[PDB]
Amino acid sequence: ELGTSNLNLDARNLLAYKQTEDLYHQLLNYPQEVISIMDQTIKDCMVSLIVDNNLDYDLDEIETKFYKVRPYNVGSCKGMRELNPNDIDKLINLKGLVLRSTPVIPDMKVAFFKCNVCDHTMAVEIDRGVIQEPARCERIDCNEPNSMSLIHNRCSFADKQVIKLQETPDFVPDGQTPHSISLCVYDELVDSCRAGDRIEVTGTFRSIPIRANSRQRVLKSLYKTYVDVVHVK
């Protein structure tokens, strides 16, 4: 009725239903795939409701929408100092004070390519930040090779933002300098919190390699951590 898409889900409700105990544990252990199947199930049930109830509401509009779920309260919140390597790719809860937030970063979803001898364009999706650019036009008539250019302003982009978080005063054991962890928020969670706010963030504790230099492919053995946020309160 309101036209929104995001569904705020509470974890405990999964433990309330006999069927979904294993689903709850899997969410806590494999958040990415579980969230994906949750999103698709939400979209499928949304379309099925209209299909079964033969309502007058337009179906094309529903088919156009990306649907999402935002789990929260997934267990006792841990501490930034207690994040060990055992938690990499696992859902965690962090309570901390915002400290800064960078401007919106354009993150690429779909690349757009155009030929220089036939003016034929086709959009190729992206997987983990790599463009599968073609070696020749998909047109049979013009099969010229290595004649693809990237039209930067015709691609598709998504909203990304990097926030810095610092722990609450009560979590400091002695009074030393509080530590800092970096976050990443995408889509409707962008600009969801202002500097100096006390927020509780639920996300996946991820880790990414760092390149040694901007020329070669050598990576430092030390991995840098961050949090991929899915819900903010």
Binding site: V117, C118, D119, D141, C142
Partner: peptide, 12 residues
């Protein structure tokens, strides 16, 4: 003594 290939705009 040249191997030349031609492209046409009408094919666009």
């Amino acid at each position: 003594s040249f191997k030349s290939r031609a492209l046409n705009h009408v094919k666009k």
